[PDB]
Design a protein around this ligand. Structure first.
Ligand code: NA
Lengths: 32, 8, 252
């Protein structure tokens, strides 16, 4: 099960973001 | 019982 | 999980519930890392001060769950353990150093909408994402507040990684390189933490490089839950990756 680790059929496979994942990305790029 | 560390 | 919110369905499909049915209890969280292996905290399975010493038959692993207290007929998978591997240098006497355990499942699981393994970090992913101020996500069915108060449904919270000197200054306990800490500082105003019943659950981060979720930490310990000037401590998964690989190599 290594090769398809970390993908969510209900999210990334459908190009849908979850309600708070952008908060994570915001912290990696900006943080202010 | 607490030895400071609280295991979750 | 303290100061979090309800998970969306299928938001954390690697989430595993460690559950005993008699007496009926949520023991711990855990994470699915392949078709046959489950990752958790050692103290979920072995903690002599609380007369905790589970063997393969004392425990069921429930995968694909959303509700805490409801059998979800058409989504959940219940697996049985073939073997438990506790880290050989796990320290229950002092500081929960190397609080990590692997569980081999009896039969492989098939993945679904609700059941999917999380990635383990490679050197670059671990390095680049595990930086102070960068946020990860913790999930679980544990306490909604410090108590000596449980949710119906899986909870989620996002929390920033804290600088090691700040983690060191926060506590009287000897901490090691096999631990990191996360949560908001007092003057950052914001709140959130894991709590009792969340241990073994994954601290995850989403890689912008490949859009995959990776597990950086395992909920381990704290001093109370969501206190000012205190942080949650997490088992440092990458630091212990060699051991994980060795176990899966040897016994897989
Ligand atoms: Na805190």
């Amino acid at each position: 099960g290594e090769a398809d680790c970390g993908l969510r059929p209900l999210f990334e496979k459908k190009s849908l973001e979850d309600k708070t994942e952008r908060e994570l990305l915001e912290s990696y790029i900006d943080g202010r | 019982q607490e030895d400071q560390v609280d295991p979750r | 999980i303290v100061e979090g919110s309800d998970a969306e369905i299928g938001m954390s499909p690697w989430q595993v519930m460690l559950f005993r049915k008699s007496p009926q209890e949520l023991l711990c969280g855990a994470s699915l890392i392949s078709d046959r292996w489950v990752l958790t905290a050692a103290h979920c399975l072995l903690y002599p001060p609380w007369d905790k010493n589970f063997t393969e038959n004392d425990l069921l692993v429930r995968i694909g769950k959303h509700s805490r207290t409801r059998y979800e007929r058409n989504i959940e998978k219940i697996s049985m353990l073939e073997k438990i591997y506790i880290h050989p240098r796990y320290n229950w006497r002092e500081n929960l150093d190397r609080d990590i355990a692997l569980m081999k499942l009896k039969k492989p699981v098939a993945f679904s909408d609700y059941i999917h393994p999380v990635c383990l970090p490679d050197r670059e992913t671990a390095a680049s994402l595990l930086q102070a101020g960068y946020k990860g996500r913790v999930t679980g069915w544990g306490n909604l507040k410090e108590t000596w108060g449980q949710p119906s449904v899986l909870q989620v919270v996002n929390l920033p990684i804290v600088e090691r000197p700040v983690c060191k200054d926060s506590t009287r306990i000897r901490i090691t390189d096999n631990m990191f800490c996360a949560g908001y500082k007092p003057d950052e105003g914001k709140r959130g933490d894991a709590c009792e019943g969340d241990a073994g659950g994954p601290f995850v981060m989403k890689s912008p490089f490949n859009n995959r979720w990776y597990q950086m930490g395992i909920v381990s310990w704290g001093e109370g839950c969501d206190r000012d000037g205190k942080y949650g401590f997490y088992t440092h998964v990458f630091r212990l990756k060699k051991w994980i690989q060795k176990v899966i190599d040897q016994f897989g």
